A paper describes a structure:
Inherited missense mutations in the myocilin (MYOC) gene, within its olfactomedin (OLF) domain, constitute the strongest genetic link to primary open-angle glaucoma via a toxic gain of function, and thus MYOC is an attractive precision-medicine target. Myocilin has no known function, and there is no glaucoma phenotype in Myoc knockout mice or in individuals with a homozygous N-terminal truncation mutation or hemizygous deletion of MYOC, but rare non-synonymous coding mutations lead to toxic intracellular sequestration of misfolded myocilin. However, not all mutations in MYOC cause glaucoma, and common variants are expected to be neutral polymorphisms. Among the common features associated with pathogenic myocilin misfolding, we demonstrate that a single metric, OLF thermal stability, can robustly segregate benign from early-onset disease variants.
At the outset of our study, five variants could be confidently predicted as benign polymorphisms: T293K, T353I, K398R, A445V and K500R. These mutations are all found on the protein surface and well documented in the literature. Thr to Lys and Thr to Ile are less conservative changes, but in prior studies, T293K and T353I exhibited wild type (WT)-like cellular secretion and WT-like thermal stability, and were found in the control group for case–control clinical studies. Modestly lower levels than WT were detected for T293K, E352K, K398R, N420Y and A427T. Structural integrity was further confirmed by high-resolution crystal structures, which were solved for 11 OLF variants.
Numbering used by the authors: 244 to 502
Write the structure that this text describes.
């Protein structure tokens, strides 16, 4: 069932990167797995550097946690930052030094669609507060695929658009009043965008909400712990109903509760 976020659990570390290449990154599972993948399949991208192309794929959670990848994909174009997601068999990622979102079908290693996010800032215009070229952040929730960004028209306030997952068309767009550069990251649960106050503090909070169904913005004070003091990626997985994050080399997951 769906509801408002009311609680976040303690971060649990599932894997720790062993080199500086993985100081920041993105790891994820597919909330709508398709053959040959399952809900155990995990993908990991270590995103430090300027030619990020390697995507580590693990058939089993045990392999993700303790072993080597079962497959490495080499993306056909370098990827930007930590905002990518996997949805219904495709990796959705942002091309380096662009506002282009790319749909890369994992089982065939084929680019199926590319879309400029209209008006979106990129490459350090509207990052989250830590920087990292985090201008464009994809998200999956119970209703499918979204993108979080900003524009000059929005004066840097978070904008979110629902995306067609097949062709990347924008279906609907909402504008919040939350300065994107003022929050550490964001994610969407049940159609509500939530933000995190700090990427360094052990005593951060989920501090704002914007409900796309009602247009209402709220403040919140839900505790959120950055166990390792540098969270570069915070996303929601609607199948597991958990937050997935990357915090200073560590791939972590948080339980949640909804009303
Ligand atoms: Ca996010
Ligand atoms: Na994302």
């Amino acid at each position: 069932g769906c509801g408002e976020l009311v609680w976040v659990g303690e971060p649990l570390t599932l894997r720790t990167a062993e080199t500086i290449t993985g100081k920041y990154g993105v790891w994820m599972r597919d909330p709508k797995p398709t053959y040959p993948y399952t809900q155990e399949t995990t993908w990991r991208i270590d995103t430090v550097g300027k030619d990020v192309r390697q995507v580590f794929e693990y058939d089993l959670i045990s392999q993700f946690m303790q072993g080597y990848p079962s497959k490495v994909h080499i993306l056909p174009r370098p990827l930007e930052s930590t905002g990518a997601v996997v949805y219904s068999g495709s990796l959705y990622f942002q091309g380096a030094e662009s506002r282009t979102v790319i749909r890369y079908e994992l089982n065939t290693e084929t680019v199926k669609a590319e879309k400029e996010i209209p008006g979106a800032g990129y490459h350090g215009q509207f990052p989250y507060s830590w920087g990292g070229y985090t201008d464009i952040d994809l998200a999956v929730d119970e209703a499918g695929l979204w993108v979080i960004y900003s524009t000059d028209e929005a004066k840097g306030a978070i904008v979110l658009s629902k995306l067609n997952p097949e062709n990347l068309e924008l279906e609907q767009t909402w504008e919040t009043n939350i300065r994107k550069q003022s929050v550490a990251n964001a994610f969407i649960i049940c159609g509500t965008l939530y933000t995190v106050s700090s990427y360094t503090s052990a005593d951060a909070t989920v501090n704002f909400a914007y409900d796309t169904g009602t247009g209402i913005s709220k403040t919140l004070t839900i505790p959120f712990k950055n166990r390792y003091k540098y969270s570069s990626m915070i996303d929601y997985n609607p199948l597991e109903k958990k937050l997935f994050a990357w915090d200073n080399l560590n791939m972590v997951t948080y339980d949640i509760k909804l009303s």
